[PDB]
Design an enzyme around this catalytic site. Structure first.
Site, mmCIF file in Angstrom:
data_model
loop_
_atom_site.group_PDB
_atom_site.id
_atom_site.type_symbol
_atom_site.label_atom_id
_atom_site.label_comp_id
_atom_site.label_asym_id
_atom_site.label_seq_id
_atom_site.Cartn_x
_atom_site.Cartn_y
_atom_site.Cartn_z
ATOM 1 N N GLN A 79 -132.502 -30.680 -5.890
ATOM 2 C CA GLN A 79 -133.577 -30.660 -4.886
ATOM 3 C C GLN A 79 -134.913 -30.225 -5.512
ATOM 4 O O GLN A 79 -135.474 -29.192 -5.160
ATOM 5 C CB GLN A 79 -133.202 -29.726 -3.732
ATOM 6 C CG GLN A 79 -131.893 -30.128 -3.020
ATOM 7 C CD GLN A 79 -131.694 -29.425 -1.685
ATOM 8 O OE1 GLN A 79 -132.532 -29.518 -0.790
ATOM 9 N NE2 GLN A 79 -130.568 -28.745 -1.536
ATOM 10 N N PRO A 80 -135.429 -31.032 -6.445
ATOM 11 C CA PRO A 80 -136.555 -30.593 -7.281
ATOM 12 C C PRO A 80 -137.939 -30.568 -6.593
ATOM 13 O O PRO A 80 -138.909 -30.059 -7.177
ATOM 14 C CB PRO A 80 -136.526 -31.588 -8.438
ATOM 15 C CG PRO A 80 -135.958 -32.861 -7.831
ATOM 16 C CD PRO A 80 -134.977 -32.399 -6.763
ATOM 17 N N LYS A 81 -138.037 -31.091 -5.374
ATOM 18 C CA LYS A 81 -139.327 -31.159 -4.690
ATOM 19 C C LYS A 81 -139.534 -30.079 -3.636
ATOM 20 O O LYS A 81 -140.543 -30.045 -2.937
ATOM 21 C CB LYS A 81 -139.560 -32.561 -4.115
ATOM 22 C CG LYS A 81 -139.812 -33.580 -5.220
ATOM 23 C CD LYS A 81 -139.534 -34.989 -4.759
ATOM 24 C CE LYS A 81 -140.805 -35.702 -4.409
ATOM 25 N NZ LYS A 81 -141.439 -36.313 -5.615
ATOM 26 N N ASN A 82 -138.598 -29.154 -3.565
ATOM 27 C CA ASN A 82 -138.651 -28.076 -2.592
ATOM 28 C C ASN A 82 -139.475 -26.895 -3.160
ATOM 29 O O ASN A 82 -139.364 -26.598 -4.348
ATOM 30 C CB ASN A 82 -137.196 -27.711 -2.280
ATOM 31 C CG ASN A 82 -137.051 -26.400 -1.584
ATOM 32 O OD1 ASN A 82 -137.142 -25.359 -2.208
ATOM 33 N ND2 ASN A 82 -136.785 -26.438 -0.277
ATOM 34 N N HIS A 133 -144.362 -29.201 -8.625
ATOM 35 C CA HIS A 133 -143.871 -27.824 -8.760
ATOM 36 C C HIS A 133 -143.486 -27.548 -10.203
ATOM 37 O O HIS A 133 -143.672 -26.437 -10.714
ATOM 38 C CB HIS A 133 -142.640 -27.576 -7.869
ATOM 39 C CG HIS A 133 -142.861 -27.877 -6.419
ATOM 40 N ND1 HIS A 133 -143.777 -27.197 -5.648
ATOM 41 C CD2 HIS A 133 -142.274 -28.777 -5.596
ATOM 42 C CE1 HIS A 133 -143.746 -27.659 -4.411
ATOM 43 N NE2 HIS A 133 -142.851 -28.629 -4.354
#
Ligand SMILES: Cn1cncc1CN(CCN(CC1CCN(C(=O)OC(C)(C)C)CC1)S(=O)(=O)c1ccccc1-c1cccc(CCC(=O)O)c1)c1ccc(C#N)cc1
Ligand SMILES: CC(C)=CCC/C(C)=C/CC/C(C)=C/COP(=O)(O)OP(=O)(O)O
Ligand SMILES: [Zn+2]
Lengths: 407, 323
Positions: free
Chosen positions: B108-111, B147
């Site tokens: 979940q790299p966009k959180n 991020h």
């Protein structure tokens, strides 16, 4: 003339706006080409199907989608379980843009729900029993101002709200998003927005904040999330809008910012990208195009004599065409780009962007551009808060009756 | 223990080791709005999370429960906060937790929450030694992940890990010279190491950028970087730049080149150059070419620029009304 195409995106010259990749392919150009091909198919569908284009905002379909969502959502929305006041705001604002009244039964239920979301020590959380956070705090305040009743205004515990804001304030002028959380320019916007609407701005609350925001403007001209980071439409909107509230827009290089945002409109698609060399997306119809009214006002306040008195400094027509042709789901709701699924966030910001693109206003001067059928016209939105300007005035007037907490 | 997506995952209301606890239903009120019809699995985890949060039970089982609540909704910052309370209060091994966060970020790299959590862990451990390689793996899957770049800048700045980054930037610019996040990182690295006041550095950067422009004349990133590094000192400060751009006109033109020309002319006029009016008319011609033909999406901006230049640099600009 008869040979003339009134739609900008459908003119024969428009094909010259397709990507030139200089015979050098990279992931960026491959991805951009795919989008353009998909969009060209949409633009061409009328001609291939031998119909005359008719641009219609599907109001009834959008209303049904919204009216239902305000009450109940499928488990597709589980990932927004810590953002429920955002859902309230997106839906109420979309309904407001479409000029659909809010039943008093609805209004009171929303009020009561947001009361449950409010922390005993100030601010609102994503849902009942959740810790407070500036993002749902911002959304909750906007939602209550959209309702705009005595009951709604009274939900907000102003003393605790101010205490909450102070607890997040950093020595360098920035704000945490929440206790134990991260700092970025969104927090300055969220705090400035709720503090100005509810009249709780003290002499020192935003000490150092304008200067912190200005440090986030980078070599590109736009604004990054924190100093050093790539410019992005969402952060650029937060930065400029917050500075407008603080009356400190001149802290920025307005000219490099103007150049940057205007460059973010896509020559082929008509919509806006969020940063240089990424893809068009309907939600930037607000985050990016919403900068133009803010820049206009700031530049006008400096007595800029060269400002238009009838249009924003972006292609209003091309943006409407993108939204109307590419961003509407036939079943109701709007979306990011063709191929993507509808959701309430894009429904809010695509319509907000459509309104901006339709309505120019600078002091006494007013000029509308409404592409497609005249029924397409939306209610105006305030470029700082993204709620109706009438709701902004009504809320500020009401809260100005009250003393700033602490006096 | 029992992974959320394990075929043998069992609801918390069915677990013997949770029998002593009464789950806490969500308090939505008598007539709810934006009510989410949660799946069984989701509602079950969060009813038990509400229970341990309410009791402030700092236990191994509560800790394990937060892993499931996070997996169900990684944006739930309340769960993340409680998980960090438990990490400290239970004295959990933080490298084990680093292993955990690296796995969740991969999926979940966009959180926002997952990256903030990782930062806290690095701060607690005062150990940045896994960071640059970890981030590089995320960027190998999405080279523009915002991020990831932000965390990379934070790590480099806070731990002074500047030495190899320009080399990393050069590698990524080779993979995709259109990657704007990488041009930004280039500027971040140079700004904070040598600065751009060093004439040999500036010269090197401009030559590099012009070379990239020649290879990919319609790549907007290289154009914005050239302008970015030259504009604070003022484009007119660099007399050769103009002639060298005009020499790209023939076979390397773009609306970007034309627009850059106008920026040079604007600054020349600002610093009262020779041939004031000649420069003005060149600029005004370009503004019209851009507005009418080469960059019509920006017609309003280019007409505003044309009007702006006219208004302050025309021969009549300083002339009193009576004249
Ligand atoms: C792919 N996409 C294109 N446009 C929107 C998206 C996804 N976004 C989330 C958008 N925001 C910013 C970025 C967008 C791209 N990224 C992303 O796709 O991440 C995942 C969703 C896959 C996890 C990263 C996030 S946003 O939610 O951060 C946001 C946008 C606009 C206004 C508010 C917010 C926001 C507001 C309050 C809290 C948050 C909390 C998350 C957090 O800070 O921890 C986010 C989104 C959000 C809500 C809905 C709905 N309904 C639909 C989509
Ligand atoms: C008030 C408030 C909360 C404002 C925030 C508005 C906003 C849109 C912020 C975006 C931040 C962000 C991480 C973008 C990157 O997403 P991405 O790289 O997957 O999408 P992209 O390709 O369009 O940059
Ligand atoms: Zn979007």
């Amino acid at each position: 003339p008869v040979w003339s195409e009134p739609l900008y995106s459908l003119r024969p010259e428009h094909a010259r706006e397709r990507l030139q990749d200089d015979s050098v392919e990279t992931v960026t150009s491959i991805e951009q080409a795919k989008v353009e091909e998909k969009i060209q198919e949409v633009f061409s569908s009328y001609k291939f199907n031998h119909l005359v284009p008719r641009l219609v905002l599907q109001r009834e379909k959008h209303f049904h989608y919204l009216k239902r969502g305000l009450r109940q959502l499928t488990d597709a929305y589980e990932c927004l379980d810590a953002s429920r006041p955002w859902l309230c705001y997106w839906i109420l604002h979309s309904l407001e843009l479409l000029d659909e009244p809010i039943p008093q039964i609805v209004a009171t239920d929303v009020c009561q729900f947001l009361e449950l979301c409010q922390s005993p020590d100030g601010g609102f959380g994503g849902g009942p029993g959740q810790y407070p956070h500036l993002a749902p705090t911002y959304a909750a305040v906007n939602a209550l101002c959209i309702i705009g009743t005595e009951e709604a205004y009274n939900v907000i515990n102003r003393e605790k709200l101010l205490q909450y804001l102070y607890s997040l304030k950093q020595p360098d002028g920035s704000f945490l998003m929440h206790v134990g959380g991260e700092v970025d320019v969104r927090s300055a916007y969220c705090a400035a927005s709720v503090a100005s609407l509810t009249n709780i701005i003290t002499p020192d609350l935003f000490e150092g904040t304008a200067e912190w925001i200005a440090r986030c403007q980078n070599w590109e001209g736009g604004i990054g999330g924190v100093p050093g980071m790539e410019a992005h439409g969402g952060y650029t909107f937060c930065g400029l809008a917050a500075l407008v509230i603080l009356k400190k827009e001149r802290s920025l290089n307005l000219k490099s910012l103007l150049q940057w945002v205007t460059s973010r409109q896509m020559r082929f698609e008509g919509g806006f990208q969020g940063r240089c060399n990424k893809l068009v997306d309907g939600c930037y119809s607000f985050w990016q195009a919403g900068l133009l009214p803010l820049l206009h006002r700031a530049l006008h306040a400096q007595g800029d004599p060269a400002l238009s008195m009838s249009h924003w400094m972006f292609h209003q027509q091309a943006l409407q065409e993108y939204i109307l042709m590419c961003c509407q789901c036939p079943a109701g709701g709007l979306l990011d780009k063709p191929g993507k699924s509808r959701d309430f966030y894009h429904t809010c910001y695509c319509l907000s962007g459509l309104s901006i693109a339709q309505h120019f206003g600078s002091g006494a001067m007013l000029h509308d551009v409404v592409m497609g059928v005249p029924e397409n016209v939306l209610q105006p939105t305030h470029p700082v808060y993204n709620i109706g300007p009438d709701k902004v005035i009504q809320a500020t007037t009401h809260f100005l009756q009250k003393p700033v907490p602490g006096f | 223990f029992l992974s959320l997506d394990s075929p043998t995952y069992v609801l918390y209301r069915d677990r013997a080791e949770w029998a002593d606890i009464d789950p806490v239903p969500q308090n939505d009120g008598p007539s709810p709005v934006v009510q989410i019809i949660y799946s069984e699995k989701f509602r079950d985890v969060y009813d038990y999370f509400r229970a341990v949060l309410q009791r402030d039970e700092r236990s191994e089982r509560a800790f394990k429960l937060t892993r499931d609540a996070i997996e169900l909704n990684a944006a739930n910052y309340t769960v993340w906060h409680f998980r960090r309370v438990l990490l400290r209060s239970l004295q959990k091994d933080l490298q084990e937790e680093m292993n955990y966060i690296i796995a969740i970020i991969e999926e979940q790299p966009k959180n926002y929450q997952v990256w903030h959590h990782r930062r806290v862990l690095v701060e607690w451990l005062k150990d940045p030694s896994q960071e640059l390689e970890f981030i590089a793996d995320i960027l190998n899957q999405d080279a523009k992940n915002y991020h990831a770049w932000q965390h990379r800048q934070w790590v480099i700045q806070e731990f002074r890990l500047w030495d190899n980054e320009l080399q990393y930037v050069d590698q990524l610019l080779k993979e995709d010279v259109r990657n704007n996040s990488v041009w930004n990182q280039r500027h971040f690295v140079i700004s904070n190491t040598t600065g751009y006041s060093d004439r040999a550095v500036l010269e090197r950067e401009v030559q590099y950028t012009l070379e990239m422009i020649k290879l990919v004349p319609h790549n907007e990133s290289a154009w914005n970087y050239l302008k970015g590094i030259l504009q604070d000192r003022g484009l007119s400060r660099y007399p050769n730049l103009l002639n060298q751009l005009l020499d790209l006109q023939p076979s390397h033109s773009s609306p970007y080149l034309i627009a850059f020309l106008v920026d040079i002319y604007e600054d020349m006029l600002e610093n009262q150059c020779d041939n004031k009016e000649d420069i003005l008319n060149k600029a005004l011609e370009l503004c019209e070419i851009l507005a009418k033909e080469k960059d019509t999406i920006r017609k309003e901006y280019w007409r505003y620029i044309g009007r702006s230049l006219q208004s302050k640099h025309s021969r009549e600009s300083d002339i009193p009304a009576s004249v």
